[PDB]
């Protein structure tokens with residue numbers, strides 16, 4: 001068994017190995033990468049996502065989100081307060097202001113300690129799920145706007161044409177902006193490229209242990225769990241690494257820097273925070289190995305979750321028994 005301890009693996013593909021995206025995902029899994037739930041991919045030195053980032057200030061963040069926290073420092077929920085629209089240039093200046101700028105710190109570990117100590121006492125502003133791409137059209141390798149779509153994958157595997165598209169999203173972050181514990185919609189894969197700016201720290205639970213995190217979440221957020229059998233689909237719950245270790249939950253952590261890809265694997269729970277102003281791009285994707293995960297993926301039928309993008313057709317084909325219930329909610 002490859003990677004039996006479920007460590008996060010880091011890959012350094014050559015420019016030749018960087019041509020065939022599907023092949024390299026398969027290669028990483030042959031080495032046991034998926035057992036961690038998260039892998040880092042450092043692109044070859046010959047590669048660039050685009051020429052510069054000098055001309056992105058005019059992008060519009062139509063609905064910036066202020067992340068207000070409730071709870072204790074290591075166990076808390078956050079809700080998203082909608083703010084007036086602002087451009088990326090305005091957002092960058094806001095992130096670097098005294099109220100929101102990264103504090104002095106000596107290393108990633110020091111900043112991590114500051115994050116979990118002080119996160120709940122602030123409310124950073126986040127730009128998320130903005131349809132778009134910053135990859136140059138001339139970038140042919142690992143361009144997140146040019147992967148095979150999930151709709152085509154299901155057709156190839158199961159023989160069924162379905163409606164729907166599969167396009168990338170942009171994220172604008174600042175210090176303490178937070179993504180709560182979650183798996184992807186339908187427990188899909190995701191791939192995230194950090195285009196620009198300060199790092200993002202990730203936490204991840206191995207897919208083979210995801211149910212352990214679910215059980216701890218039910219214990220730590222008991223009202224939330226009574227309201228929905230899959231409330232982590234709401235993407236509002238945070239649990240610190242200290243509390244995870246206290247409860248024996250298997251997990252790993254890693255910091256992603258500009259110019260690095262991260263891939264999350266099916267049913268790999270992950271959470272994290274941004275260190276300062278940055279810009280990332282991400283999209284979900286599927287492989288033949290995902291189909292079995294899609295069939296078994298939990299759903300939220302209580303109304304809250306909504307979604308990154310339409311799962312209707314995936315639920316309809318892969319989970320026909322659930323379709324009606326999930327539909328009504």
Ligand SMILES: [NH3+]NC(=O)[C@H](NC(=O)c1ccc(Br)cc1)c1nn[nH]n1
Pocket residue numbers: 080128129171179180182184190192235280282
């Ligand atoms: N799969 N998504 C991610 O892992 C994560 N975004 C979220 O979890 C998220 C939560 C609530 C809302 Br609303 C919108 C998005 C991310 N990726 N790069 N930056 N953040």
Ligand SMILES: [Cl-]
Pocket residue numbers: 103114115118
């Ligand atoms: Cl701080």
Ligand code: NI
Pocket residue numbers: 182183184190264270
């Ligand atoms: Ni995610």
Ligand SMILES: [Zn+2]
Pocket residue numbers: 227228229230231233234300301302303304305
């Ligand atoms: Zn729900």
